[PDB]
Each structure stands twice: as structure tokens, then as C-alpha cells.
Amino acid sequence: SKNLFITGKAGTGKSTFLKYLINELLFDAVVLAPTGVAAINIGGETIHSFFNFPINITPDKIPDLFIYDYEIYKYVNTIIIDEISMVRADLLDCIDLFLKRVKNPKLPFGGTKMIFIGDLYQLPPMEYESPYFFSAKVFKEMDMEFIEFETIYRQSDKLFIDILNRIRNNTVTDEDIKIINSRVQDKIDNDDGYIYITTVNKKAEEINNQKLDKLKGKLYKLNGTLKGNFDENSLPTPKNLHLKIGAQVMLLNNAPDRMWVNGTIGTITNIFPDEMIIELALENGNIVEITPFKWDMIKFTYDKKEKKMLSETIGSYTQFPLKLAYAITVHKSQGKTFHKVIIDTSRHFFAPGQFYVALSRCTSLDGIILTKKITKNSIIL
Ligand SMILES: [Mg+2]
């Protein structure tokens, strides 16, 4: 029974379709994701919580890993892992190794049927050949179906989408190494409307708190409420939300009236905390009214009464779906596009391919700025 890899985009569809899947059709399946935020966005459990993995988990640490509940996995026969590109090679082998301990040890993933959901950009054809998931030892042991389901479109408006797919296979050409330098500015208009892309959370938090500190409006300090058991390492936005008028922010939910999507940029025009309203102006002019938003933290549990897997809500987090959007790391911007992005090379290191993902996060390459030149062998993925 083959497993499945599919290439699906983080739309509202995916999230609710997965709920229908594992509630109305499948009763022996769960939905995992690599980080906490990624897990709450789609209503799943993080891989680490589902397996009670310590934070520094590694394949050799597995044989002697303590197991809280040997029984839950006996009832789990299909595992869906979303945002598969954010899973490390060694982590996927830990999952395989783990399943083999609790489930049938002679088969890959203990015999569990595995479904992987990734992005159009991250795709495949004793020591690891790369940190990316397709370099897991367990890919050797098994065969998969490949569905490029959401391949009928992409996340860029311009015609030279081709350039992204041209440096994919190291075929980045001299003829098209320029224009790629044409975007090398010297940043005369600092910075309005551009989000900086970085590699280190430290320096992204530094640029964010730079811009906020200079804005001369009063400082507002919005406090979200945590109920029950909610991991404070998976807050989509800080519990101490610091904001001012004029702040350049990002939206962290998908509007139901399709007025915005996770990643949309805006500017705060008013803050009214007694009424629990933040007003912001979008890029296309429209002013919106943002009220707080409740995220649910799930833990899968087997209901012995009904003989099906249930998503049991173990906590909640209520805060305004916003965070400072002057800067973000390449990792924390996984499902977002943006329109005005700054990729500084002078600061921030971008190993070729970390640099590619960066480029993969601007609607158009006209809304891009760089610092230094770009050669043909510095794009050798
Ligand atoms: Mg099933």
C-alpha cells in the first residue's frame, strides 16, 4: 500500500479539508506539523508532541527514548505531515525509527501509511547528504505516489516565474544573471513598505524593534489571554504585543470573507483597546478592522468509546492576529509572499538555496532590492 506525497498550498481549503478528512472519512489518522505555529494554523499536533520527542531528538537517541503511551499509536494508521519541507532529514528518520518500536518493526514507519504535504518549490526528483527531508534514510526503504495537486498555479504575478525554476536545476544562465543585478540598489528610500528578509531571528527581532522604537506615536501594549495548556513557544504573535500607530504589521489568519490571507501587510491607523479593535490600512487602500483571534491547541487522543481518533483541544490563545512586519526570517515566512522585500547580503548570511527561498517570497522581482552582485556559481543550489 503506497504512501503519498502531494504538493498543496496553504489555503483555507487545505486546513478545513483535512478536518473533514480525519473526522468524517478517516477515523484512524492524525495530522502533524513540524512547528507549533504550523500545527495550530491547520489544527494539528506538532511532530514533537505527538511522539514526546525531546527538543534535541536524533536517531541514535531513539532506542533509549522513554515512551509515555505505547497504546495511542496502535490506533493510528495514517499520519499526515503538513509543511513537510520544514522537516529535517534526521527528524523524519526519528519518526520512522519511533514507529518501528511501537508498530510493526519490519516495515517503514512501522507500517503506518504516511502522507506528506509540501510546497511547489521544495520537491524531489549513514551520514546525511543534506538536511532536507528527502535525504532521510527512510526514503530509500519505500515507494510513494507523487501528486503535484496544486501545481496549476504559483505565488507570483509576473511572467518570469521561469527564473525561479531556472536556478532550481542550476541552469541559471549568463543571459539571465542580468537582469538579476538590476535590483542592486543603495537604499535611498529607507524603507517604507518593504519587509527585510533575514536568516537569524535575533536580527529580525532587532529590525522590528528598531522601526517601532522610532515611530513617535504612543506605545500600546496589547495582552493576549492564555487558557488551559498552550505552549508559549507556539505563540503566532507575542503575548506582550507592542504596537504603535503607523506600525507596519502582518496578518496571521485567513479572513473568511477573503479580505486578507496569512501574510498580508498593512499599516496601523488606529488602536482602540477598550473596544478590542485595531484598524489598519492595507496596501490596496482598503482600511480594515481587526478584532482578537482565538487559536486552538490540539492533542490527538483515541476515544475508546467511539473507536476513532479525536482532536481534543487542550488550550487556547487569544490575541490580535498581527505581528511586526518590518522583518521576518526565511523560516518564519513559510507560507507567505509579500510584494516589497529587501534581501541584504552585506548583513544576514544566505547560503545558496536559503537565498532562493528568499527570492521565492516576493510577488514580483520588480519589488526586490539587493546589496551586492550575484554571479553564476553563487546560485549553485
Ligand atoms: Mg486511514
Author numbering: 20 to 144, 156 to 411
Paper's wording?
DdPif1 apo crystallized in spacegroup C2221 with one molecule in the asymmetric unit and DdPif1 in the complex with the nucleotide analogue AMPPNP crystallized in spacegroup P21212 with two molecules in the asymmetric unit. Only DdPif1 was solved in two different states, apo and in complex with the ATP analogue AMPPNP. Structural changes upon nucleotide binding are moderate in the absence of ssDNA, as already observed for BsPif1 and ToPif1. The main difference is the folding of the N-terminal part of DdPif1 (residues 1-20). This N-terminal part is not visible in the DdPif1 structure and may be disordered. Since we observed that the N-terminal part is not visible in the DdPif1 apo structure and contributes to nucleotide binding, we hypothesized that it could flexible. Therefore, we analysed the structural changes of DdPif1 apo in solution by small-angles X-ray scattering (SAXS). The molecular weight of DdPif1, estimated from I, Porod volume, and Volume of correlation (Vc) is 50 kD, which is consistent with a monomer of DdPif1 in solution. Thus, the DdPif1-apo structure was modelled by flexible fitting with DADIMODO by introducing flexibility in the N-terminal tail (residues 1-20) and the linker between 1A and 2A domains. Therefore, in the absence of a nucleotide, the N-terminal may be unstructured and becomes folded upon nucleotide binding.
